[PDB]
């Protein structure tokens, strides 16, 4: 069983590299819906916790990282975080629904991966990966089907 | 790749109700054949892609790629004397005229599709289910073409 703990839309400032021997970069915010999932594996019934990002203006824009205990120790202690595994998910959710906190995306020169960060690389630091194949299919079909409805609605 | 075919064609959708039974659930339907001619990203030899599409099932997608030995045995099975670049004029014409049957047979697994000329004798062509980037392309079209008739209303 898949339980979301959080699936707002935020405020994030979207940054990306454009230029080889020239630092250019293209940034602007942006409405960046974050869905928080608590899921356990399906080969050992281990806890994990899976961090997705999606752009309601772009369709294509869909990358994800699902972190796992052995997974979150090696981040805890990059960005100083006393907390344990179980205790993250209520931190963060709690540090997000804070007005005052500052998004930052930090995405990949190829757009293959994005750091996703809170107020700077220091502070906090996913690295989320490229949603592709059966995953963005999916996603791309809601997309459709929710757009058919609208439609639909549409009189 | 150079578009020889992009029509929208009324064709007689048959969909599998059996296993170890021919009983199916027949009904006209619009789709959208579009036939082009591309080069082998390997080798620089001639191909054509078959490519059908439905405007009411955007998962709905299904091509197949002919090559000049793909053709080869194609020809010899429709009893087709034309050689495989003389072959597009010989079918386009044939789809253009409104006396030709348009039947498209579908898998039970949805899978692959049958596309034939009144029945297979004819022309039939067996075109697989399409997936991939090939899929994600087509679906990100449908997205961005409704994205703009959200805008406008």
Same mark, same amino acid.
């Given at each position: 069983?898949?339980?979301?703990?959080?699936?707002?839309?935020?405020?994030?400032?979207?940054?990306?590299?454009? +230029?080889?021997?020239?630092?250019?970069?293209?940034?602007?915010?942006?409405?960046?819906?974050?869905? =928080?999932?608590?899921?356990?594996? *399906?080969?050992?019934? /281990?806890? /994990?916790?899976?961090?997705?990002?999606?752009? +309601?203006?772009?369709? /294509?824009?869909? @990358?994800? *990282?699902?972190?796992?205990? /052995?997974?979150?120790?090696?981040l805890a202690?990059?960005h100083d975080l006393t907390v344990?595994?179980?205790?993250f998910?209520?931190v =963060?959710?709690?540090?997000?629904?804070?007005?005052?906190? *500052?998004?930052? %995306?930090?995405?990949?020169?190829?757009?293959? @991966?994005?750091?996703?960060?809170?107020?700077?690389?220091?502070? @906090?630091?996913?690295?989320?990966?490229?949603?592709?194949?059966?995953?963005? %299919? +999916?996603?791309?079909?809601? =997309?459709?089907?929710?757009?058919?409805?609208?439609?639909?609605?549409?009189?």
């Amino acid at each position: 069983s898949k339980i979301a703990l959080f699936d707002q839309t935020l405020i994030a400032s979207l940054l990306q590299p454009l +230029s080889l021997n020239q630092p250019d970069f293209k940034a602007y915010k942006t409405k960046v819906k974050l869905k =928080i999932s608590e899921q356990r594996n *399906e080969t050992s019934g /281990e806890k /994990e916790l899976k961090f997705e990002i999606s752009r +309601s203006d772009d369709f /294509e824009f869909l @990358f994800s *990282e699902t972190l796992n205990n /052995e997974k979150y120790q090696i981040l805890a202690r990059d960005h100083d975080l006393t907390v344990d595994f179980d205790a993250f998910p209520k931190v =963060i959710i709690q540090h997000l629904l804070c007005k005052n906190t *500052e998004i930052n %995306i930090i995405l990949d020169a190829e757009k293959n @991966f994005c750091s996703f960060e809170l107020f700077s690389g220091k502070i @906090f630091s996913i690295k989320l990966h490229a949603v592709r194949g059966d995953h963005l %299919i +999916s996603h791309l079909l809601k =997309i459709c089907s929710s757009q058919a409805v609208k439609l639909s609605t549409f009189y």
